[PDB]
Amino acid sequence: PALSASSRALIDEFMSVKQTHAPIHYGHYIIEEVAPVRRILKFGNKVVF
Amino acid sequence: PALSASSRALIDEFMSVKQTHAPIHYGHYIIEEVAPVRRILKFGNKVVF
Amino acid sequence: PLNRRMQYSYYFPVGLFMPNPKYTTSAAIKMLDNPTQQLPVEAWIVNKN
Amino acid sequence: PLNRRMQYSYYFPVGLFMPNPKYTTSAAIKMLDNPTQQLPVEAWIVNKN
Numbered sequence: 001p002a003l004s005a006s007s008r009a010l011i012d013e014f015m016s017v018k019q020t021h022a023p024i025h026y027g028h029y030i031i032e033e034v035a036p037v038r039r040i041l042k043f044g045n046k047v048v049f
Numbered sequence: 050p051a052l053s054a055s056s057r058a059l060i061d062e063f064m065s066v067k068q069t070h071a072p073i074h075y076g077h078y079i080i081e082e083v084a085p086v087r088r089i090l091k092f093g094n095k096v097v098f
Numbered sequence: 099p100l101n102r103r104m105q106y107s108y109y110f111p112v113g114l115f116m117p118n119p120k121y122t123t124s125a126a127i128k129m130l131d132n133p134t135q136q137l138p139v140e141a142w143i144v145n146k147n
Numbered sequence: 148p149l150n151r152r153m154q155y156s157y158y159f160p161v162g163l164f165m166p167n168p169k170y171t172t173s174a175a176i177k178m179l180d181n182p183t184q185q186l187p188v189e190a191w192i193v194n195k196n
Binding site (some may be wrong): 015 | 155157158159160161163164165169170171172173175176178182184185186187189190191192195
């Protein structure tokens with residue numbers, strides 16, 4: 001699976017808080033990539049491994 | 050006892066925050082398993098041991 | 099002969115009803131249902147994989 | 148000959164709808180749209196860069 005976010009808001013809140021982000025919002029959802037290559041996301045200053 | 054949750058809300062709140070997830074909600078409940086083997090639970094990227 | 103296979107049981111309920119003076123302890127989840135009337139009908143189990 | 152290349156298949160959802168009894172897990176996200184009727188028509192991905 002690959003990174004899928006229905007809204008910019010969900011992916012923002014994922015980037016901010018890695019552990020406590022909500023996977024399923026009221027109608028919007030997010031999918032975190034599980035792939036043998038682990039890439040670094042550099043949105044702005046904040047970074048998620 | 051084995052891992053049994055009445056809805057996906059409780060399993061997601063267990064997976065995101067381990068300690069202070071509500072063991073029982075208004076009408077929905079959840080049980081953490083207690084077994085001589087201990088298994089790593091993986092969801093998305095988050096991992097609960 | 100020292101690769102013994104160890105067997106033990108598991109058990110878990112489904113369909114229980116909480117008493118009427120209900121309570122919570124998690125500030126997060128907002129299930130959008132009516133709180134006083136909700137009842138669990140199914141169970142969710144985390145598989146071996 | 149040792150400089151090799153690996154081929155993966157990346158999997159990706161778009162345009163799904165969630166069941167009606169909708170729930171959330173995180174309180175931070177705020178949307179001015181009504182939660183009962185929300186439907187995503189797009190999908191956001193992270194590019195290589």
